Subunit: 376 residues, 3 copies
Amino acid sequence: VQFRGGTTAQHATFTGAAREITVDTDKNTVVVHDGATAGGFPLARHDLVKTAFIKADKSAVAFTRTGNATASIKAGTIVEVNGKLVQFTADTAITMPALTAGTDYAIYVCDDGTVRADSNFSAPTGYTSTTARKVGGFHYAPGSNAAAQAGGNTTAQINEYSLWDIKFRPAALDPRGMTLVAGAFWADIYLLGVNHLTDGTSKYNVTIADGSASPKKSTKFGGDGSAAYSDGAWYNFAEVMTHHGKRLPNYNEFQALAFGTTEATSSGGTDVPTTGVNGTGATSAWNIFTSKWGVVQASGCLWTWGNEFGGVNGASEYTANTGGRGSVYAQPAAALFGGAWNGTSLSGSRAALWYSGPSFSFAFFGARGVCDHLIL
Amino acid sequence: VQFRGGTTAQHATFTGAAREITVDTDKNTVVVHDGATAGGFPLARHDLVKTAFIKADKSAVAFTRTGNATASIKAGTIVEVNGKLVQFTADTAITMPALTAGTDYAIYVCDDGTVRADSNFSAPTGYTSTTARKVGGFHYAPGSNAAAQAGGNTTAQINEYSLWDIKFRPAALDPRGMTLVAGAFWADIYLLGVNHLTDGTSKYNVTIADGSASPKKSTKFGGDGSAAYSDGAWYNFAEVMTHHGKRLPNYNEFQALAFGTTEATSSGGTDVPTTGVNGTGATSAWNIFTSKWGVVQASGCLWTWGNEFGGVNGASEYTANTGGRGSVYAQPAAALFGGAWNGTSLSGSRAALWYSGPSFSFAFFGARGVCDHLIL
Amino acid sequence: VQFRGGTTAQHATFTGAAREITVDTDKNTVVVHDGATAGGFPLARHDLVKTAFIKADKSAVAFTRTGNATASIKAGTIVEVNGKLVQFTADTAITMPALTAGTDYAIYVCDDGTVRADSNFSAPTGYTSTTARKVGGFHYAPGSNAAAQAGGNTTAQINEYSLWDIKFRPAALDPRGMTLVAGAFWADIYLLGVNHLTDGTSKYNVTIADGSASPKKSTKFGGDGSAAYSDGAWYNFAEVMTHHGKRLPNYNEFQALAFGTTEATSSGGTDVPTTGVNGTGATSAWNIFTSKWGVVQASGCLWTWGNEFGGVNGASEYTANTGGRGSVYAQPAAALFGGAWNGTSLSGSRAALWYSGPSFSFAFFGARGVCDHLIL
Ligand SMILES: [Ca+2]
Ligand SMILES: [Ca+2]
């Protein structure tokens, strides 16, 4: 059976009988008629809804943490995948792989109706990127979020605040390794690593960048992927954050992201070389410094440069201390937040040092990234 | 009549006759054929367009203020609701309830084609949240926006700049009580209240938070809903703004949001206890300080803490004045903007005090929230 | 042939035969049946997908620069236009008009399947805004982006980083004349002009605004379209940026946007009157100062005010220097970035002067706008 048909122009002056269907041959779609409306009611081709993703509560992430190693997709979630409508009318368990501490996972909704996590960010095992659609993810952290203001534990588990979906997520170039602070903005779970080009800015069990272990030079700002900066100036850390679509924290962000850490406490010892791992000679284990949001080594480990200027000024004369990119006059300090391993009682979620010019470089000054929260 | 049908895989190698319809039984949808294209043209199921909201001018809000107590939805607006397409092809009057000064209203598009406002943010009277879809809202203010630079009046009316829709709105956790400043960012209409957990940060006729009436402690940062902060430090006000997905204003934002206030004028008297209400012993009524955008008590009533540091520094020694969250060194002042009731000619949209450290607390220092503008 | 039909309520308790189609006469749509599901599967009317715009890689712009005067739309792009699905399954050349140095172009996808650029931002020549849909655009710059750190050339060409689409774009009120810096945020290609109300903030070959050529007073802040500010205070430039949904750069943004300029070099001579044109008596042509991202006159031409305070403070007394909008106490300097024509070796992507209060006005202090990056 072939329906009556015509071009869009032919349809424009045509009114079909009530409940008659015609085919618009310019559009290759069905047109429903009501006996009254010239041109009828053309229907949508499926490919105009490709990538549809509809949640019942758009103000919250699509997933709920149900236990340390379990999570569900929320009732009322509708997902287009590979030409099909896949939906969930009740909270539905996400099928999990083996989960490994300090690893990011992608959540896929698949055209067979299943929802599954995988460490692979292209496709989950057994599927392709056509049959499995990446819709979100989470961080499987090396320890719990802080329940109060005494840090967290060392039991690996899903960080509920690290759950993201394609419409509830960091406004950074990659969402991995970040956590949502107070529903307001996202912070890197880990201090910036040296190898951030390969690892992203926030990765577990990597060498921390600082004045004596400078980060790789950004490949968006003249780097070749091998060269590192000459030192740990604010300038270099700010440049690295920009590369990744992030920024250094301001004071309002810092006090929020670090809340839950053990206040007035520092790592001790002589160094903090590695993310999510005890410091060298540390008297407090790394988890003492986990925030409510699961920010790791949030205070008392390494100062983070901040995106705010004020405090002690440099000389009231033009000074060429920018790495060959011009001179500065009466340059205010750039903020440093959180304290470092040698800070004893001075460290905490509001610890702030306003002495250091942006050209300064020290083994206890590094960086943590933040970015805005995006709800679509 | 039952159409020929098959699975998606069966369809993949099938080319129907021109204008033939088949049914894909895996997808439960219609497939239109053109006699040429293998697999044909599958059509979209309605639930893949659930929540569709389409405006002719996406760069502007969906509604127009047509009078003090009247507004319309704009021509060209298409809204999915309860399985139906509801649209407006000409500007269409919004059906209003009784409007009460200082109250926020939700705008609903309903599956019967009507558009109506209500003080209830779940459903309008006579409907449910299934038959009525919340698409936006406005503030019915206690007085007019400023026409020039002499404040506003006390005639309750819709604030045109407070109109928001689900794709043109504050990037804060709740849009209520905010206004759009110069099309650029949103500001709280009201100074922060003590009871912000129950009221949100911006509510009419509530007790204003300050150093002598501290805000409720944020329940995202250890609060229980009853306890208040010990004082009115910058730290506490910044924490409260973060709770709500807001921040304190910077200087650029402050001068914009307060433009239209009566400059070089203060409330007078001895206190400003309540939002949108005259101060105690006030020589100027509250409306003298309304901005162009309908920001209430925009200057000359209470200083607002700002999200910027600089000016006078605290001691160049580690100082434990953060409420037990670490120490600060050479701490710059946090900005205070706008002047307060005792400011006489010093107050205004660019009044700025850079003396007070973030630990300071006074009865004339409070806060106002801002956030980014989101157009989707 | 008229299909069986009924209201939505009649459909609710009706289960059609497998592969039967009915018409819902309340919705004017087709309902597909499966012999099992009461109410069947209603299909979407086309107008619920009006404005659909779907890209294969939503993290990148929809277009690729293929040569100095050529560009393509990317494979996998699906566009709703005038009731039709228009798509591209391979990278497809954009049809170009004559291209003129320093001009912004709009890219349209048309209902005949073509994709074309035009200087007209309402419709391309030969089409209307109904048959041609504006989906993005670019800047055809007066010279190349910087390949290293020695500026660019004077060969007019598409600036690849200025490519924007309706889902990958500046979060400013108009996208024209901006470029994406490191994938992170957008900057104005040109310094602010006097006639920004008519031209926008970023336009080629216009008079640059500064203390001796003040910008037009914003019509959102009391301007009439003819009057200019009395001077070039920070306050006035910040107000202008707000008008356009922009802000002045911070230090992190400035060093990023100016990277690629010839460092420690200034224009020379006695003035830089005009955007994208040599300065008066200039010893370096304008293109010496083009950044990697195609920011023109990025350093060494005019200082830009910044959105950051610190450095040298004004008096610790209330001072009425805000243009009649209140007084300031211990007012910190507002940042100035980049150097100016008289800066010799002091200029560069990190040049920063923290001496000038926001009330100061000089012929070598102007402004450049930035804004956030939006990916939808
Ligand atoms: Ca500052
Ligand atoms: Ca700042």
